[PDB]
Amino acid sequence: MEHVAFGSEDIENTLAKMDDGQLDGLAFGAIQLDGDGNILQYNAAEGDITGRDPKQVIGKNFFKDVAPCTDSPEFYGKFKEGVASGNLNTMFEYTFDYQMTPTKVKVHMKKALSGDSYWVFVKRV
Ligand SMILES: *C(=O)/C=C/c1ccc(O)cc1
């Protein structure tokens, strides 16, 4: 277990040091996206929540391919505003329901420390 709390003020500083293997030790789901929504990282906790195989979704587009239920003003719309603004920090509840049992989650999106990367953090509620 990597000891980082969901919603920590400086989470993007803490996660900047972690390889794929360390990300898999987190207590919550973590996805790293580029500015276009392509998945750069996807940890084991997230695969446990959603059923997706982490290695097979890297390189796919989260909003177009993997998670079409997030293609809406309430999720994707907030992401694209943050990318265009260069700043993003928002937390909200959502239901994941594509090809899965509908699962309610808390979502935290935050701009990463590195240039053109954005974190999506997920935990059950
Ligand atoms: C809605 O289609 C959500 C799908 C989804 C959310 C999060 C993931 O990690 C994978 C699929």
Swiss-Prot record:
Residues 23-86 form the PAS domain. GO terms for biological process: phototransduction; regulation of DNA-templated transcription. Coiled coil: none annotated. Gene3D superfamilies: PAS domain. The modification S-(4-hydroxycinnamyl)cysteine is found at C69. Photoactive blue light protein. Probably functions as a photoreceptor for a negative phototaxis response. Monomer. This is Photoactive yellow protein. The gene is pyp.
